[PDB]
Amino acid sequence: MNPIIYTTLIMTVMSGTMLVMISSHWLLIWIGFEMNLLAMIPVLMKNFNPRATEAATKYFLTQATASMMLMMAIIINLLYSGQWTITKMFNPVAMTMMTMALAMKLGLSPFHFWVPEVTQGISLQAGLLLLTWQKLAPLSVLCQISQSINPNLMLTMAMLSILIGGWGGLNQTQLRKIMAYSSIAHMGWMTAVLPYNTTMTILNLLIYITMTLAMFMLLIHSSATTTLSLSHTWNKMPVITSLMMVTLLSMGGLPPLSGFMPKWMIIQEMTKNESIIMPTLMAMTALLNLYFYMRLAYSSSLTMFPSTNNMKMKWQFEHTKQMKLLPTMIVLSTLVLPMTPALSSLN
Amino acid sequence: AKTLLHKYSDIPEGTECHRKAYASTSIGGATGLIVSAYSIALKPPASFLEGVARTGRYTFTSAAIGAIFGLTSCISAQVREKPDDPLNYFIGGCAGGLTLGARTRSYGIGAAACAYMGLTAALVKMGQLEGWQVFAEPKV
Amino acid sequence: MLKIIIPTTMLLPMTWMSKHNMIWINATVHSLLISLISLSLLNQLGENSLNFSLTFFSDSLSAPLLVLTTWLLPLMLMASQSHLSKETTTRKKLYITMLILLQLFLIMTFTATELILFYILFEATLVPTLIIITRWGNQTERLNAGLYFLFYTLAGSLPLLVALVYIQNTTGSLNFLIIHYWSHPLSNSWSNIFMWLACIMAFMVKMPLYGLHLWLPKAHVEAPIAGSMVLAAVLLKLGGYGMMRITTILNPLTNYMAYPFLMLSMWGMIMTSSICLRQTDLKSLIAYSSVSHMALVIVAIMIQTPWSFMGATALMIAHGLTSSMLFCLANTNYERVHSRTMILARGLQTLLPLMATWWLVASLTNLALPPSINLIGELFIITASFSWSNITIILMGMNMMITALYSLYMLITTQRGKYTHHINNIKPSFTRENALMALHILPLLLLTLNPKMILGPLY
Amino acid sequence: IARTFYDGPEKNYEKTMAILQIEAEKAELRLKELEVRRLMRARGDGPWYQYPTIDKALIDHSPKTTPDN
Amino acid sequence: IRLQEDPDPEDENLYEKNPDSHGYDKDPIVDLWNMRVVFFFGFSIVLVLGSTFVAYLPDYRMQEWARREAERLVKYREANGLPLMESNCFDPNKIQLPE
Amino acid sequence: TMMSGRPGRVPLQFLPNEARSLPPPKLTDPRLVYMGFLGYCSGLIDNAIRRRPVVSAGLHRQLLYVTSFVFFGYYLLKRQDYMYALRDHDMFAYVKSHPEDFPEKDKKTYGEILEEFHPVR
Amino acid sequence: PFFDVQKRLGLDLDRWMTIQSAEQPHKIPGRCHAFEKEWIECAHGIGGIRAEK
Amino acid sequence: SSLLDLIWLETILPKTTSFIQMKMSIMVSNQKGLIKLYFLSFLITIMISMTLFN
Amino acid sequence: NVLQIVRDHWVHILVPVGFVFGCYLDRRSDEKLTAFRNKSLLFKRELRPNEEVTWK
């Protein structure tokens, strides 16, 4: 694909997301979603192969179904209220349709399978863009319409997302599938805290985006897509493996790393609303995410797996391309716990 | 689901054990039907008869668990003359776990289910007594 | 507390900028200097604690633990420099950095004035420990040991975080002074029962309580020498310190919820002593001895009397020193023969005399031999338990008998008898090892001379 | 030793008093903030939780084709 | 065999090259100075100076002050017929019991 | 959204004009020092990843890292302080405006308050 | 989430189409123009909670 | 040592929980990647959300 | 030479300067808590003619 075409497709995806985030009209929000999907599909299919084609097909089908449900919700809300402005929806059925459509777009359980399937199908850069941006937009819409979200349905989907992400990531060995299940679990956390504090939702979104960017940039640097492929990186550049081990510890929520701040603030906020069973279950379920993070860390950094013979030539050569802002992502994803009270600025 | 749950709540704890058993069996049957529907959707059977058999097994197991739980809890509370006691719910939960173990024909599964379901039912009774809420309504 | 915290954060750049052959010298010298500086905290008041600022404060309970940590760091440095001779300079610096971070987190944990900050730091102590274990352990079981340790501690501690945030929402503050002056009785209800369970279970897992201890043999046996030294000396005392601090607001529910934990602690103390009687591994024997001693500390804290708290503090300090010394001795014998089997190497009394003397003194302090602070703490706990009930004397007597039996069994098996004929690589004991043993043992006898310094605020 | 390394008990006593005052005020402020948040979310008569309503500047008041609006 | 793996090296003895070795390092000079700094600082400085510092720590726990106060109170109370130990910590006049 | 939709809130304004009435953070703020420390760590990680001498190479790059982090940290601290001050101001105004909901209570001493005593034995 | 670029810049991108009481071509009135105007004027500037109540 | 410490105290907390997590993980991840199957699951979820939640 | 020795033994000042800085920061933290200095009921007293504060 031509570089100009690639950059204009990326700019069109970002334009669609910005249209969603700045529009006050439901029709314009739907237009933004449609533009985002339309420009996103070729980005997934950039590196042509059967896996990329299948991932793009599944993602397109899921997003088209979600967009149809979202438009139906918009029309139903218009019927009972005659309003197009994005505010508290005036019909419970329209709200249920909108919530299910946005959950399907975000990949929340039980609409999750496409997330690991597409993430394994597509390359590392495509997966990074997918996770980050395509979680950024629907969560913006949900934060806008939070005051009419049904707490029971939202919390049920969030808990299902957390459990399913933990179990799937526990079973998987492929790095992209592990990242997808981690994304599912973090989406569960954020949507669980959504009906109480959209500021906490945004804080968790920022921390998750930073950690995911750092992890995907490290994976791109190591050029590893499986566990065994990552197990050879210690013999070529052990710094990358150490930084990735620290990032993995952060993603599990271990103090005093950055990953503990979202869980801590979400638990506090949800406890303020006289909810204890849900925060306790959400905290206890994250141990599965921590377990498969630790299993990945054992293979890559804390131990030394066998290597091969051409790794000598790999030693002789040097990494040419540079991914700027990677050190900043590594710092911000591990060492921003003391700066927690900035969430008021985020407010 | 809301209708069945509020019916079960409306029926008093220590009285009308037949009604309690019927309500619990209905709740279990609904749960088993939903589980069987999801199972058939995600992991399709090789034949229509196999699908019907799987649905029947799942629904009957869930209904048996519910009926045993309701009967055991109501009878225990009635004979002990101690309503609002989590011990009755623990006994009912362990009875349901033993029913699940008998259905699956596994002593270890039965013991683990007894322990976990007894703890869960005791926690549910404690929450009903103390006003604990799972899906807490937003405030503050 | 900054006059102690900042020197460690300066030890980090010193370690990372020192020359390759001077890292151990610099770290040891400046760790000893920091310990000498931290000795000033022992000058405690008779009425209230030392409130340095809004964030850090020191008490008659926090001071001895801080001094123990600062004194334990150089001993860990000596053992590590013993067993890490072939590592690269960068990995040596990383190991020293892990030890420094662990000491810094422990200091901030013991000096934290708020419960949530205490929780954050005492959870932060897991990461350096896990890295040390799973990276510089020798055996294949270090990975499983690290997993067990991490998940036991975290499954204990997450409900503690929920309980702490709930307490903050309900009362308005988690500051220890506020929760002590504004403490209110805890009514008998399921909600209060489960709050009590969350807090106490977190700290019991950290203790560890009997039935929640498997991670302790797993981690202590499979960790390196420095990791084993810090796990038993200080990291086990986080549970006791937390329980002493947290039980302010849990009354009078503690009078009724302590029965299962007291029964578990007493019977498991007996069971772990009996296990020590029939252990084929020396590190496992020392780990189960640690389990028994911490079970006794649990009993003291649960019965919760002014005489029990003093004995609990004294026993914590004495057990820390004794366990560190025993682990060091076992590590020296392991470095001799590259195996942890207790009956593999015998006749060490006639092969290494002064090391046999160190073994004898360590074993004598392990059992409660008066007037050692081990005996002081154990006797105070036994008397408080006797006041609590008059069959606790039966249980404590059985435990003391089995403790003496297994201590002297370890001593006789390792030292007495005839040497193994085919083991001919037992070189004379090093000056470094002998100095390590002397630095382990002499402070114990000096604390025996001056006992009121480790009896806690209740003195 | 007391002359060189330590200060009088008055310093610790009064520092403790100041620390206690600060922490008590913070606790009272936290509880008051929780009460204010609960009231504001329940009523919607304060600056917080002011969900957007439709601006009335968009309404066109010019005469229409039909006299009855 | 399944790998190109180094054989396990023989254990190294420090006494082989340096008969008078303290066990700190391979280099004799660095080993000697490590021993010197450890022994001097640890034993002399920490043990002796910290132990005498703890021995001569000022009486901030007010043990002697409490003994003197108790002596004065006992003298005053026994010289006037008052009980040596009061029966109440606080004043019943200042305590207002509910009815 | 608690403070979103507050009356008189200008959209997309990082710091409104009313924030100028608050004390600006000191240049030696410990939070600013921690931001500079984060910038220094970012520079060190940059050197380590690019396989340069960690402490020596790229002094200009490390300086720019530290300066950018300090700049953004200063403005972030200003916004955080403004938001917390606004929250406290609104809370106090609401407490003033709702005396019925926030009434003064009679203060009784511990000599008058009856508290049950639980013996420890 | 909602970066109000239109209100910050004084633009008008979809507020014209948001409601049926706004400026319509040839001043064609809506079916419920008066009712919508009354509801909007009642609910203006009091917040969603008070507007619903 | 054997019956309690090495067998049953291992069976209750760490081994049973790990076995349950492994079984559930296998159950969740044992998917053939068939869009027909999980879209039928989507339909069931939509109907359940419409009916059960009110 | 001195330049070679100092280039190797300059790290030994880090812990001492950290201790000095920590003591200074302790003094600074103490100087912010003078809200009840010479105002506690137990230790309240009149100032001497040639002193400004009771403690620093």
UniProtKB/Swiss-Prot annotation, chain A:
Key words of the record: Electron transport, Membrane, Mitochondrion, Mitochondrion inner membrane, NAD, Respiratory chain, Translocase, Transmembrane, Transmembrane helix, Transport, Ubiquinone
A UniProt-annotated Pfam family? NADH_dehy_S2_C
Where does this protein reside within or beyond the cell? Mitochondrion inner membrane
Q: How does it sit in the membrane?
A: Multi-pass membrane protein
* Disulphide bond pairs: none
Kindly give the InterPro entries that the UniProt entry links to this protein.
Answer: Complex_I_Subunit_2 (IPR050175), NADH_DH_su2_C (IPR010933), NADH_UbQ_OxRdtase_chain2 (IPR003917), ND/Mrp_TM (IPR001750)
The enzyme's first-digit EC class, named in words, is: translocase
GO CC, sorted alphabetically, is: mitochondrial inner membrane; respiratory chain complex I
Enzyme Commission numbers on file: 7.1.1.2
Keyword tRNA-binding carried by entry: no
Q: What sections of the protein cross the membrane?
A: 3-23, 25-45, 59-79, 89-109, 149-169, 178-198, 200-220, 237-257, 274-294, 325-345
Its UniProt entry gives the catalysed reaction(s) as: a ubiquinone + NADH + 5 H(+)(in) = a ubiquinol + NAD(+) + 4 H(+)(out)
Q: What does this protein do?
A: Core subunit of the mitochondrial membrane respiratory chain NADH dehydrogenase (Complex I) which catalyzes electron transfer from NADH through the respiratory chain, using ubiquinone as an electron acceptor. Essential for the catalytic activity and assembly of complex I.
Query: What family does this belong to?
Result: Belongs to the complex I subunit 2 family.
What subunit structure does UniProt give?
Answer: Core subunit of respiratory chain NADH dehydrogenase (Complex I) which is composed of 45 different subunits. Interacts with TMEM242.
Q: What is this protein called?
A: NADH-ubiquinone oxidoreductase chain 2
Source species, please? Sus scrofa (Pig)
Q: Which gene encodes it?
A: MT-ND2
